Design a protein around this ligand. Structure first.
Ligand SMILES: [Mg+2]
Length: 270
């Protein structure tokens, strides 16, 4: 059979070309979240897709609770994936968590990345005296408390609120399907990690060009966070807001988001 890293992350390679586009997904989804975007890319790029460890499509026994208590475990998985599949200078396009993992990875291994397109990314969701992440700490702890109380109940509100729109919409139904296929203890572990994550000290060390993409109204990512990322990244960057509501605009608003991503994949920051 194929490599252990490839089978553990369900790595899939489509198309062909000189440049490889790598697609990463966020919490509660898997690589199937990119099914609408991939046809726009396979004729000119090689496209690699992979699942984060912990996704409902991955083996629950491979989720080392110690290893994935910080982003480093996901960052080292990504490096191993691109190594095992011999990718260099890829165009990385990732939603939320995965784009941050790629950005940090580029600090130590800049050979693997030509640029990073971050969608709805944030270095820290909790406010401090000098930083606005969107949530006071005594809101996040109350959140973390409620997720340990009734996790499935919190996720049943989480999914439509975070995606935005009608309970009946296709995006909310699809996001719920993959979110509820996760194992509760694994998902809770991931939310704990995101909840305490603070990537602010890393931003100055990231020097690969970053394209900061997010919805103008994201319940988890204030527009101030995109501006904070732009300001504190160590290399070139650009910010473009998608005029829409939702944390997963690639899933909920493809008609706006897919044209934005293709233009940022193709064109470079001068
Ligand atoms: Mg993030």
């Amino acid at each position: 059979s194929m490599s252990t890293v490839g089978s553990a992350h369900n790595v899939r390679v489509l198309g062909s070309g000189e440049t490889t586009v790598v697609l990463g997904h966020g919490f509660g989804t898997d690589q199937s979240v990119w099914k609408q975007l991939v046809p726009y890319l396979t004729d000119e790029y090689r496209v690699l897709l992979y699942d984060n460890m912990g996704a409902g499509t991955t083996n629950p026994d491979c989720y080392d609770f110690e290893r994935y208590s910080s982003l480093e475990g996901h960052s080292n998985d990504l490096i191993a994936i691109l190594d095992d599949f011999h990718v260099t200078k890829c165009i990385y396009v990732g939603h939320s968590l995965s784009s941050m993992a790629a950005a940090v990875s580029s600090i130590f291994r800049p050979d693997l990345f030509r640029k990073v397109v971050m969608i709805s990314a944030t270095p820290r969701i909790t406010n401090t005296e000098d930083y606005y992440g969107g949530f006071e700490q005594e809101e996040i702890n109350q959140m973390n408390t409620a997720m340990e109380e009734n996790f499935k109940t919190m996720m049943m509100g989480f999914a439509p609120i975070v995606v935005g729109g009608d309970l009946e919409s296709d995006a909310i139904q699809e996001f719920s399907r993959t979110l509820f296929n996760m194992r509760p203890d694994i998902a809770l572990s991931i939310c704990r990690m995101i909840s305490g994550l603070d990537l602010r000290p890393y931003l100055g060390l990231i020097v690969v060009p970053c394209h900061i993409i997010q919805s103008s109204k994201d319940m988890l990512v204030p527009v101030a966070v995109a501006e904070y990322l732009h300001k504190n990244l160590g290399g070139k960057s650009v910010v473009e807001l998608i005029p829409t509501e939702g944390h997963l605009p690639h899933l909920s608003a493809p008609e706006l988001t897919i044209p934005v991503l293709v233009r940022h994949i193709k064109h470079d920051i001068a």
